Design a protein around this ligand. Structure first.
Ligand code: SRM
Ligand code: SF4
Ligand SMILES: [K+]
Length: 449
């Protein structure tokens, strides 16, 4: 199991050129696949670690290392919090070097999908200056089909810590879960021993007491597609890449385009938790040159808001655990969803819609407004009623159905939403309000009907 350690998704252009060369020359599939944990993967490796080491990159020792890539909000609205937040994600990543998932999140963006993760540090400021974190623990999405002893769970608030406690807290949580783990994921341990019990042990091990939670709110999980103004005279260009799959396609040489950008770009790239890529820290005067290459390579091809907010996992052909197609199904599925949105006069809207190929849940369908969970070839469980910000697990609505059945249901439901929604009301929230699906309030107890 070759995935790269790459805290916060930050990769240099020299690193990019090396992985570009390796993917094209030394793999079956020839692609770079951006993952939804802000790193990249090669598929069908035909010297890989040698390649990574040659540009300062390492791969996680999966044989024994159960930590995974540490995420950090890629493109925060307050651009000046990124540097310090990233520094901490990197320090946490390095601290955890010898499964367990960690993020650093900058409100109001939940792009990193904190509720899918064991441990989450929510940035708090005073003065455009990072001062501490709220800690939320116990998220995780994997289930086993029909097994009511498994469940997706959101993360629970433990409390606030000043920056000086970050690494000790990180170590206390990871060791407490490893130790108390049976069903051995943090989410199960937390439910078994109780939140207060786990929290008290983390406090003991880290030598701290958590302070009261400090105010935070999330407004969305999407990337900021296109150009955004950064700090000073810098600009960030986020490129939508369908499924994060970087390969040259007819009329759309995505891989060649990114290589050419890497050769002239003065800053770094950032891989996002939505499987997209940011050309980060472009000076204003270099925007036109970068945009020209991107546009000409198909990297800036316009898609609907819906497509920008849809995601799938890898699934077939490379995943040995796959039950139904996900990545390969998504583009045509979303063509069909775009048709439904247009049919109903909501083409400018979006529904956070995700497809995962089996119930392990890598595509993060169990935090979607509409989630499809693979059950068998061509068949998915349809879940409804998550929200845009990703703080609620969607209950199963229809089990083990095919694409035409899914499309007929969504036609009806999207049609109702378009006509009946309140101002700014998301599809997921609407399905709950209209009594189409019951919400999940306490997943360990009420996820399963
Ligand atoms: C690439 C990625 C999906 C994507 O399209 O982006 C992915 C791909 C796979 N995941 Fe994952 N997971 C990916 C994010 C996730 C996430 C979402 C997240 O972390 O944000 C989850 C759900 C959250 C969670 O962990 O609860 C996830 C939960 C799993 C699980 C279930 C673990 C569990 O708690 O039960 C497995 C199965 C296992 O470990 O036994 C798994 C196993 C796998 C494997 C390695 C299959 C395997 O064990 O042999 C997949 C390889 C497919 C392939 O051919 O590339 N992966 N996987 C993600 C890589 C992230 C990374 O860089 O590390
Ligand atoms: S959800 Fe299942 S099919 Fe999809 S990548 Fe993860 S393990 Fe493979
Ligand atoms: K994407």
């Amino acid at each position: 199991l070759l995935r790269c350690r790459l805290p916060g998704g930050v990769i240099t252009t020299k690193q990019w050129q090396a992985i570009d060369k390796f993917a094209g020359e030394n793999t079956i599939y020839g692609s770079i696949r951006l993952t939804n944990r802000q790193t990249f993967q090669f598929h069908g490796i035909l010297p890989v670690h040698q390649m990574l080491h040659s540009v300062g990159l390492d791969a996680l020792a999966t044989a024994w290392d159960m930590n995974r890539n540490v995420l950090c909000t890629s493109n925060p609205y307050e651009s000046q919090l990124h540097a310090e937040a990233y520094e901490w994600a990197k320090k946490i990543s390095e601290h955890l070097l010898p499964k367990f998932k960690t993020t650093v999140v900058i409100p109001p963006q939940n792009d990193i999908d904190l509720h899918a993760n064991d441990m989450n540090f929510v940035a708090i400021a005073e003065n455009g200056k990072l001062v501490g974190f709220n800690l939320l623990v116990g998220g995780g999405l994997s289930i086993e089909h029909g097994n009511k002893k498994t469940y997706a769970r959101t993360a629970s608030e433990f409390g606030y810590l000043p920056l000086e406690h970050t690494l000790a807290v990180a170590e206390a949580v990871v060791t407490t879960q490893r130790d108390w783990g049976n069903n051995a994921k943090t989410k199960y341990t937390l439910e078994r021993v109780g939140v207060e019990t786990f929290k008290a042990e983390v406090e003991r091990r880290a030598g701290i007491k958590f302070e009261p939670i400090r105010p935070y709110e999330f407004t969305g999980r999407g990337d900021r597609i296109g150009w955004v103004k950064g700090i000073d005279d810098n600009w960030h260009l986020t490129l939508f890449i369908e499924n994060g799959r970087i390969l040259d396609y007819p009329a759309r040489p995505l891989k060649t385009g990114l290589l050419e950008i890497a050769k002239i770009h003065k800053g770094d790239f950032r891989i996002t938790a939505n499987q997209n890529l940011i050309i980060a820290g472009v000076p204003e005067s270099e925007k036109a040159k970068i945009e020209k290459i991107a546009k000409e390579s198909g990297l800036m091809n316009a898609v609907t808001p819906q497509r920008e907010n849809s995601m799938a996992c890898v699934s077939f052909p490379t995943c040995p655990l796959a039950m139904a197609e996900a990545e390969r199904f998504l583009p045509s599925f979303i063509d069909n969803i775009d048709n439904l949105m247009a049919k109903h006069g909501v083409s400018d809207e979006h529904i956070v819609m995700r497809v995962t190929g089996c119930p392990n849940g890598c595509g993060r369908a169990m935090l979607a407004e509409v989630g499809l969970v693979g059950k068998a070839p061509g068949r998915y469980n349809l879940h409804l009623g998550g929200n845009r910000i990703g703080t609620r697990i969607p209950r199963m609505y229809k089990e083990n159905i095919t694409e035409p059945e899914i499309l007929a249901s969504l036609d009806e439901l999207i049609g109702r939403w378009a006509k009946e929604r309140e101002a700014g009301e998301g599809f997921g929230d609407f399905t709950v309000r209209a009594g189409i699906i019951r919400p999940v309030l306490d997943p360990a107890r009420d996820l399963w009907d």
